[PDB]
Amino acid sequence: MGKRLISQNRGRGTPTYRAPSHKYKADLRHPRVDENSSLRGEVVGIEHDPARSAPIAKVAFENGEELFLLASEGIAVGNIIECGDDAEVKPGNIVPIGNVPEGFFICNVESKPNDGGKFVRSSGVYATVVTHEATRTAVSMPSGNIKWLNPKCRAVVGIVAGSGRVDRPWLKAGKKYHKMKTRAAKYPRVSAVAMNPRDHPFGGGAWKHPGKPTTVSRNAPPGRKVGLIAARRTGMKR
């Protein structure tokens, strides 16, 4: 048995591949609201979240419990939020996507109703509402695809803050090193062709070349799906 790969080591969950959970501030989710309820609340502070490298907002609600929230751009300390079914459309509120007009930008969209939000969450991303049929609504995801969501889904209006995070090049191994200390990723990563034939399917030889084609089928067993997994095309555009 030539040694397992890095992906299977991540599978086991050894301490080298586990996220340092105790650093993260808090989990981000929408307020839990019963049927036919509408709770409000005004921002108390704007705070930095080390799990995403973007700001988050602290909001104190009328019942008493405060929650961190995914901060859309423009959110300022003092503004009140009106999450609920009867909310109007403004930058900051949380409203169903069924009664959001076409052309408006949204973020922190849910998959099924009352999930808290799963799509459109990294820095500066956003999605759009395209069409409103009776049973579904099509939103263009930041990847570039059309998704058909339930009309009774919740999403904050605006775009996620922190836009432009990747216009600043690293230009050092040290800065990227410092980012990786608060993530589960491993840094730095050895290249496969420089290993031994025990360690990887590509290792070995008197000179460093893959030897076999890099594209691998989708049916390859675990421990072999390394390279271009089931690629449809390769190369740049000529």
Next chain:
RNA sequence: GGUGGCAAUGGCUAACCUUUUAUCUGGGCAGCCGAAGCGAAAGCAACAUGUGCGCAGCCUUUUGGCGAGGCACGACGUAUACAAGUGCGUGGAGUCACCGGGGUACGACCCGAAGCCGGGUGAUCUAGGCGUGGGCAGGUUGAAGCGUGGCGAAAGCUACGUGGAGGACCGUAAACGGUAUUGAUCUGCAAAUCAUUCGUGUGACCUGCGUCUCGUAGUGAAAUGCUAAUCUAACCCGGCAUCCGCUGGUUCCUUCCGAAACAUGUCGCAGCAUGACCUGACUUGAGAUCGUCGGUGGAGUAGAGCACUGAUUGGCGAUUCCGGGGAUCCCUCGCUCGCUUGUCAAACUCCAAACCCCCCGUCAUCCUAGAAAGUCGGAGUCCGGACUGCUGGGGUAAGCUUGUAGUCCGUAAGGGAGACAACCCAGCCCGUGGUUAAGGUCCCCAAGUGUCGACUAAGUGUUAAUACUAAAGGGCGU
């Protein structure tokens, strides 16, 4: 196999009971072998002596007769399914022990690896992640930003001051590392240290304590590195007394006999099986041939020769061709056919030995104190080598390689060769006397400064064979 009990009306009991302490006495007929074989099976089912040769033994006129066991026939059972031939079987000897040998399975005469698998131990070292603390003498450069001021018509250009950035610079024997001396030491201070010279030294930094990740698994800025002096799969115990055709060892005396290093088969070539060769016992009972001479037969090697098959040298006469030279093919004329000259043959032979082989007769040797033949037990051996012949085959040759006949070393003393595995004499129980073999006789060294007739003038030579000893050519040297 040696020795015993019982014996076709066969031999022996097993577990167990009687045990009265393991003994022992008497029971125990279940069962096993023998008594009928043949055939896949269904099935079928034989001589309780018909003939001859004849050993031992007995009788006898010492020649013959009877003649158990032995051998050779004849007859019969069954299978081959049609027949005919043949196979196996048939005229009653087995069974149970004790003392031995051998085969097979088990640790299997004793020791000798790397490995494979099961369950457990380890992150005090080291590798990486996380928690919480500590550390980095002293200097250098001078980014952005800010103030004042010059050149300008706007845009703009520019000097000085302040400021203190950077995986920046220099540098401690603080700390971490480990270039070169290929220095010191190399049974050391040390199972990796020391001296000088060196690299980083505000960061992808060094580090204390705590905590987590581990064996087909972990960790790795990736060398197959590290995981407790162990890592191309750790360590402890168990399977395990693993296994090997491969290496080492295997303990007292004498006596009789005494090999093979070869053929065939083999995933066979460092192994094994069967045969040849050695040894022990038994059965049978009269011939055998290691040798000589004569004869009936087999030769196709040496030598020799051209009569066949292939080559081969000139002269002569013609092929009026099949042919090359320069319009009557003007005419030259090689290949070819005959007579004569000069050479050949391992796959040529009109011829043809000496050795050698089968058989008959004779002599000679062995033999009833057991020829030839047969049956059973135990093996070793299948790495060989050398000398004299075969102009042996191959090769330039070889103390080369591969054959063959004889004899040797292996396993062979003693005598002689300077020493000499296998060259000459000799095949050897112990002691004494005697004469010889090989070889020698100036001294070393036992016995000849021996005899007869010549040669050599070079210290040539003073060297049976021999893996140890020089050639062609020349000499008015003798």
Next chain:
RNA sequence: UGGGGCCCCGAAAAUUGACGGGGCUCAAGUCGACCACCGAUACCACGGAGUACCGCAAGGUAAUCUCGUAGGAAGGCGUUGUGUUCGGGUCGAAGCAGGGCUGUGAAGUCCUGUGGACCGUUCACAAACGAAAAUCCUGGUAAUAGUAGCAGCAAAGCAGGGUGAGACUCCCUGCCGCCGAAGGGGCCAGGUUUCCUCGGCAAUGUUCGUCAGCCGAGGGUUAGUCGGUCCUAAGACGUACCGUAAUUCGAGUACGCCGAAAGGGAAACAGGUUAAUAUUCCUGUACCAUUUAGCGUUUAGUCUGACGUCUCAGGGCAAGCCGAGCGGCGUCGUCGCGCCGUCUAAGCAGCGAACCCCGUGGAGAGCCGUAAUGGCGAGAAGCGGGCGAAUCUGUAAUGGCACAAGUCGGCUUCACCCCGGGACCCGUGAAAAGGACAGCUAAAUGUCCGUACCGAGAACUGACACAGGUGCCCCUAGCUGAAAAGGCUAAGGCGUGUCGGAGUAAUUCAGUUAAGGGAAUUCGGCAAAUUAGCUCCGUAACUUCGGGAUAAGGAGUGCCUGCUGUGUAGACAGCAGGUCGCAGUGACCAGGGGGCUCUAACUGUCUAAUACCAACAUAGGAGAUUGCAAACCCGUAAGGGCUAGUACAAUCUCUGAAUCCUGCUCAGUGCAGGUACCUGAAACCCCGGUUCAACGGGAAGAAGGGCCUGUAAACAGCGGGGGUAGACCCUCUUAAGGUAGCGUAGUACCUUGUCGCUUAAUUGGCGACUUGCAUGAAUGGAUCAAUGAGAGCCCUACUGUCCCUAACUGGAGUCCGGUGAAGCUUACAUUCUAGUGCACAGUCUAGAGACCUCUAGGGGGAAGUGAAGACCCCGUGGAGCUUUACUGCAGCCUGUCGUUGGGUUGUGGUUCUGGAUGUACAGUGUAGGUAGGAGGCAUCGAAGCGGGUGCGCCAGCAUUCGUGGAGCCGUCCUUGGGACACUACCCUUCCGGGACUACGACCCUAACUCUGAGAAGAGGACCCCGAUAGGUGGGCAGUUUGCCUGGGGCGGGACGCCCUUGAAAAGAUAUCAAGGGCGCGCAAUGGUUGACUCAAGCGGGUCGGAAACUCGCUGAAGAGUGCAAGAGCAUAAGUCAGCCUGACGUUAUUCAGCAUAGCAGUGGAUGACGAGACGAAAGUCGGCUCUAGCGAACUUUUGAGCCUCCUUGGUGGGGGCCAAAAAUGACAGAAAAGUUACCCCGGGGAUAAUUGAGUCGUUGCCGGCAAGAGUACAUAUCGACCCG
């Protein structure tokens, strides 16, 4: 002139030397003869032992008996014990040491010395039964040897006086020394009594020892305030729930509980006391909690605990320094200086700098500030008040001091405390207990554990009193100086980094200096030297504009006298004059510099113990998957990682900064999509079969495959030649045929390629050309500033690297005292030369030398020692790794069955009605299936017609809605495809097809799934799950990968069969020996009878040409006989004709394969039984004249007939006997690919590199004959061919 004997020339090898040596000349040589003697265990004689065979024994015979390894056989000796017979011993058993006798021997017995209690023997039987060897095991003990070591990084001791049996080593004083930012002080972990006193010195201490961390006896650790205890971090553990065949096993969830002697934290200081304990005991002065009692009260929600890296201002203070007075000590040749001291805790009371808050204030064509950033009508400056620090002042103030002084000022201040500002982050830099806000007074309580000493060049760890490591973890005075560097000294600790004396060789470790030359040394400037601080001047090519840069290259520097400037000060900067030395950073410390190339962008990482690099990483570039109940992965499952995440994300790959760029190919392999068509398992369905099944076919058809399309920043590829100033038309184009670039390269074999610069001279360095064995574009191309313990070459300075060595210094060595090992060893040994020998001898053979012992010295030899070779081969030995090797297993994709329900309809029969619907040659009738080949119905209901009523031929049986008011049977059969009549329609059919079923699609919710505490929401009979069938599948596992071989490999097959030679005149006989062939063909190319003679020549005939057919002659074979070679054949074994199929079924021996002499199957020669062909008959025929053309067991199939399946009989289906076919060519018969330089083990000189030995083809050097050239002349000179 020829033929002979001996000798001479031809004739050269390496340590000195081989007739065996001395020597030998009418011989001590050679040739031909001869005589005498010596000389074995041979041969003769005598005596003796054993053996073989015979004999009843006595004994007899042996010229025809006496060697021996592997090995076979026979008889005996010994050790311990059992059964049995007979004994010995305190008047001395066993055992041990040495002797006498017996036996061929194993061995027995006796004697003497020792010893002090047990030991034998006859006949038999047993075994934990006999040792010289195993790099054997355990114990004891040699030589080496009184030897190495007791030096290298810290060279330390001397005098006087004691103690004591004994003094270099133990104690006191004086001098002389070592560390002094560690060798001093404080303490973690660790140790565990090492701590103190007394008494000892056998061992321990690298020597001695009266000493001791050693040995013996005794003694020593005191806490409300110092720690633990308490809180929580990473992260563990327990109980429950669930999983697992099961647990002591497994993730998650709930509830608990632990985890820091360096994180948070309620509270104590000074002095004294002991031999060893002290914020712990004692004196004094304090402080903090919990409970009880009394006297009152919340604000109860906030603050604090509570937080990163860098940088800076302000304040304070321990340490430090200076001046004056006072008290001691030192020096005193002269002077009057130098050092020590001049002290004082917590607690309590008081004060408060910055920031911040409040009341006034009214500032702009601008004012107020900071080291700096800055502030301002959203209210500056200024003026008031409030909250608010370290530290400071008083008291505590009487304790300690030689009760000796004990008084004052000043400067500075880190590395410590307080307070505030700024910058940076694709880094954001802990939590909880506790505390504050309502407490005051009084008494009582404050349990438990640790406390000695070390904390390291002697108390820990590495086996040690170990030059390593843990701990340099935290602290440290004066001068020089930037400094905690280096040097010199305090306090403190030591003369123990535990051997001394003596002073004299070589050699050795580490240093100092060196004339003249200056890399000439060497693979290579390795090693060593040069330079070196600070100030000023000056500074190149190139460049990513940041740099290069301390570039390069120059000048100054001491001491004394007097000053100036900045500053609150500490201090810093500058000047003028004088002056000394060879030298002024005077010692310590402290860069040599420059130029041209290759390579990697840079800082970083790496084989702990031979590799610090060009390798790895990196920022930058590109590609791929995935919309989250996702992609990727772990688990048997329960459940999880990524993930407190969401496409500016995670995961998976290639390339490797910047700059200029990145061409052509989709044939191969891989990947993705399409699946028109072909192939494609099981279940269900249909047919046949089976009294039921097994079983055989058909239909249908999932995934996958074929086929098609796309894809190269997917793995990869980018070719020949010959025409043409090496072009370009053609090619060879099995997809295309190298674009920019670079080019003798880190790639170029030829090769030291050609030319230029660099040297007197260059297999070099650089530049240019370049036909590139075998360059080339993210298998990245080219170039590149800065960086480099990277790799080459050149210049300058410098030097003992060198010419060529010399003197000196310290440590060893040499000599003396003490202590005190280890490793090679069969034995002997004073050697040298040659030979011989397993061909590399101190021991053998022949010579030559050598009196013995000891010391020093370097290493010639002992194929010196260390070690079961790492190189090569072998083993039906291993391991890891790779793949389109052989066989499998996980993972994934898909069909079917279960979980699994209710409807919408399209499917098909299943199943059910209205008519026998049934009807062509029609019909009066509709074949009321078929059919008793026909006899009952009918105004008591039967007809012709309608759109037409079952239906069909708009006919007509039924009586239906009628319509006329007869269709009757048919023996008028519409004389029939079927000819027809009611109680029969049992059945072409009709087919609401309702009905259970299986398919394709759609809908619903109640199962089920996800989310939520739950209401509920979202999906939904799908998915997950259990089982089964097919695919893909080096992800993983178990194995195989042969042998021969002038080593293995490569080549080949001498790996099965047949012929000739080798092969030596019977038979046998090897090599990778020579010549070769076969793995077939034929219904005639076979059998038999009959008739004939073939090849080649000569003579004749018409173009029938020297190429045809025919006639005559010669013709033993010169032809033919299927195929190699050899053999055979003439009234034939050849050619042709006639008739035929013996190219037959069954069966026994013998021969060779495989001499002699075992071994399949299988073939070839004789026969036997049964049938034939040809021929008058004899006879011939078991294929093709003879010798090649082929394969076991097991398994399947086929042929004839039988035997058989478990209590009996039958059916279907199996099993068996005999023969034929299907193949194992590695051919006496495995289902079978590579690599290892990361390798491991067991053996081999049974087998290779090269040291040796043998040979000499080749190589080096000569000779013989002389052909010829040399103007004539072979030989002044050169020398052919051939020969040695």
